Structures are given as structure tokens and as C-alpha cells.
């Protein structure tokens, strides 16, 4: 039970539905978990470059040395604050690659720069840092792997549904829509462009897989269908909200993160960071929103750091 009163935000014409509903007691749990990190004082300008002073820099070579050290202080406070600087080095041999965390970290720096520069159709001028997903822990909280399903007899193949389904909002819908959509690249659209029978050959099962993915979009942001659609025509772009256009880019963005960066790391990481089928943990909508309409309610952290 969620006892009244509630908070309602209108987001459309009057008498059409189209509004978002909040319970003040549940929203307090999301407010009580954000915790924007504290600023790091800007670095003294000018000096020698990192490429001319350090021995093994392959990404951040065009920062001054002050900017470099500042970036490293930030990487410690964002990812691994408990274990300290030796989480990704040996003792004080900074230039060694003897740990896998340094390879992982280098690849992650590249991925964050790519998202911050090339995907502004989705993260527009707020960008991301490490803290957007690690939130001060080495392993992020909300990730996914390819779901094998419940245990069934050995001669029975999986259909991929009719269970509880914890990632698709507790429905009996297909329980793993991320493999075909957020790592593979399948068509999400199912409806026709004319009113009578034409060349469209999609089925009700494909419609169910789409419905599953949309359920996850709703849960990961704290909203309903009507945050981006008018239900009377889920396929018309002239009857959608403006928020449908960033989500369209978000999809593509997530595929990039998983195809170019995170899945190829399956060689470097240990067996601890993999699932039943032997693939690493991957990124969702929930990996950075974590139940809010913008990660951390949209505080712009990434502008203060020229390394990202």
C-alpha cells in the first residue's frame, strides 16, 4: 500500500491521462542515495606536458602535469576510495601494467571520452564521469549478463518467458530483452505505416519482446509510458513528447558502450566478473539512471575535468 497523498506532474494536454505520479515516501529513498561528490580545487596552469615527463601515458598525454595529478586524485575518489591508489598499480611503480585494473581503467577512460564528446544527442552538456556508475565502488551496482533461465529438464529448450522476471518489472514477459536489443541490434518497431494489410510480417511474440524492453525503460527512469508516448498511437512520432528523441539516441549509445568497450574486456577481467555463460557484466539504462529521470537529478559534474 502507498497511502495518500501523492505528488502528480502534468505532462500533456488536459483530459488525456499523460502525467507522472510520485509517492513522497518512496522518492525519499532515491533522494537519500544520490550524494553528489565534493569538488576538487582547479589546478595551477601551465608547465610541462604529461607526454614529455611520464613514461607510459597512452591516453592522457596532452594534459599538463598538474592536470594529470588532479585527474588521478579524482579517479581514486570516484572508483576506489577505500583501497586507495594501489588499487590500480603496484606499490609505487606507477609505470607498470602488472594489474588488470590498469588495462580496464585505460579502456574505461577511452569509453568515457567517447560518450562525452560524440553522444551529446543523449547526454547533452551534462556528460558522465566514473561516479555516474561506480558511485565509489569498484563494481557497479546495476549490471546484467545473458540470462540462462530457470532449471528445467535437459531435453527442454528455453523459450525465455513465463517466469517471474525480475528485470522486466515482475511480469510474465520475456525475461532477457537486453541480449537482442542492447548488445545485438534488432528492430524495435512493430507497427505498420498504412491501415490495410501490407508487407509487414512482424508477429505478436516480437511485440512481446518490445513490450519487455519498454518496461525496463520505464523502471530505470521512474516514469510511465506517457513520459514519451500517447498510448492511443505508440508508433506516431507526431503524437510523442520531446523526451522520446533523447531515448532514441540513448539506445544507440548503450550499444556502442557494450560492443566497442565493455564486452572486449572479457579477456582481461577475472572469472569473478562474469556470468553463467561466461560473458562480463554489461550496461543498462539502470546503470546510470538508477531510478531517476536524470542520473543524480542532472548536476553537471563532468565540465570541471578536461581529461573526460
Amino acid at each position: 500500500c502507498d497511502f495518500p497523498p501523492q505528488d502528480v506532474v502534468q505532462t500533456g494536454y488536459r483530459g488525456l491521462g499523460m502525467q507522472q505520479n510520485y509517492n513522497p515516501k518512496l522518492l525519499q529513498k532515491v533522494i537519500d542515495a544520490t550524494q553528489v561528490p565534493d569538488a576538487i580545487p582547479a589546478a595551477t596552469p601551465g608547465g610541462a606536458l604529461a607526454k614529455d615527463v611520464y613514461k607510459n601515458v597512452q591516453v592522457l598525454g596532452d594534459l599538463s602535469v598538474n592536470e594529470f595529478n588532479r585527474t588521478m586524485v579524482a579517479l581514486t575518489t570516484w572508483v576506489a576510495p577505500n583501497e586507495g591508489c594501489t588499487y590500480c598499480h603496484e606499490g609505487t611503480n606507477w609505470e607498470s601494467d602488472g594489474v588488470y585494473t590498469k588495462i580496464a581503467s585505460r579502456r574505461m577512460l577511452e569509453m568515457t571520452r567517447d560518450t562525452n564528446s560524440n553522444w551529446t544527442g543523449h547526454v547533452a552538456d551534462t556528460g558522465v564521469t566514473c561516479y555516474t556508475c561506480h558511485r565509489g565502488k569498484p563494481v557497479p551496482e546495476h549490471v546484467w549478463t545473458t540470462d540462462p533461465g530457470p532449471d528445467i529438464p535437459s531435453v527442454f529448450p528455453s523459450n525465455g518467458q513465463n517466469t517471474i522476471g525480475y528485470n522486466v518489472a515482475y511480469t510474465a514477459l520475456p525475461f532477457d530483452p537486453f541480449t537482442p536489443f542492447l548488445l545485438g541490434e534488432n528492430e524495435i518497431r512493430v507497427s505498420g505505416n498504412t491501415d490495410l494489410r501490407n508487407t509487414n510480417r512482424k508477429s505478436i511474440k516480437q511485440a512481446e519482446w518490445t513490450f519487455a524492453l519498454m518496461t525496463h525503460f520505464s523502471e530505470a527512469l521512474g516514469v510511465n509510458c506517457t513520459y514519451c508516448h500517447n498510448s492511443r498511437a505508440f508508433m506516431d512520432w507526431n503524437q510523442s513528447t520531446p523526451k522520446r528523441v533523447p531515448a532514441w539516441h540513448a539506445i544507440r549509445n548503450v550499444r556502442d558502450i557494450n560492443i566497442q568497450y565493455v564486452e572486449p574486456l572479457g579477456e582481461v577481467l577475472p572469472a569473478s566478473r562474469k556470468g553463467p555463460l561466461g560473458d562480463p557484466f554489461k550496461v543498462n539504462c539502470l546503470t546510470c539512471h538508477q531510478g531517476a529521470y536524470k542520473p543524480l537529478f542532472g548536476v553537471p559534474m563532468a565540465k570541471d575535468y578536461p581529461a573526460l
Partner: protein, 72 residues
């Protein structure tokens, strides 16, 4: 006793109806037969699809006539 303990057993059918019992036994046995066959067919002991003594779909796919037709 231990030997005369089951003497009056034949009197059972003076309190249990023979017709109801017969029908119940027959129906229960048929239901149980279907159930056990279905449970064993859904395991590793399955005997229709195990491809022993030979696989027949595979045998049909590799007949020379079918191979020559697929080659074009």
C-alpha cells in the same frame, strides 16, 4: 498371531463397494500410465529422440537424391 492376523480379510467387500472400487482402480491406472510415460519422456532416458539405433531426419537429409537436388 502373526499368521492368523489376516483371517477375516475377505469380509472387506461387505463394507467396500466392489463396483466403485473396480472403476476407481481402472481409471487411476490409466491416468498413472500416461503420467509416468510423460515424465520419463521428458528426461535423459527419452527413447524416441535419442537417435538410437539411428537418426532418421539426418538419414533423410543425406540421401543422394536430396543432396543432388540441394546442390542446385
Amino acid at each position: 498371531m502373526n499368521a492368523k492376523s489376516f483371517d477375516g480379510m475377505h469380509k472387506l467387500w461387505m463394507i467396500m463397494n466392489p463396483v466403485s472400487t473396480l472403476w476407481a482402480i481402472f481409471i487411476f491406472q490409466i491416468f498413472l500410465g500416461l503420467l509416468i510415460h510423460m515424465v520419463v519422456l521428458s528426461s535423459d532416458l527419452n527413447w524416441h529422440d535419442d537417435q538410437i539405433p539411428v537418426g532418421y531426419q539426418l538419414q533423410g537429409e543425406t540421401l543422394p537424391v536430396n543432396l543432388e537436388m540441394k546442390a542446385a
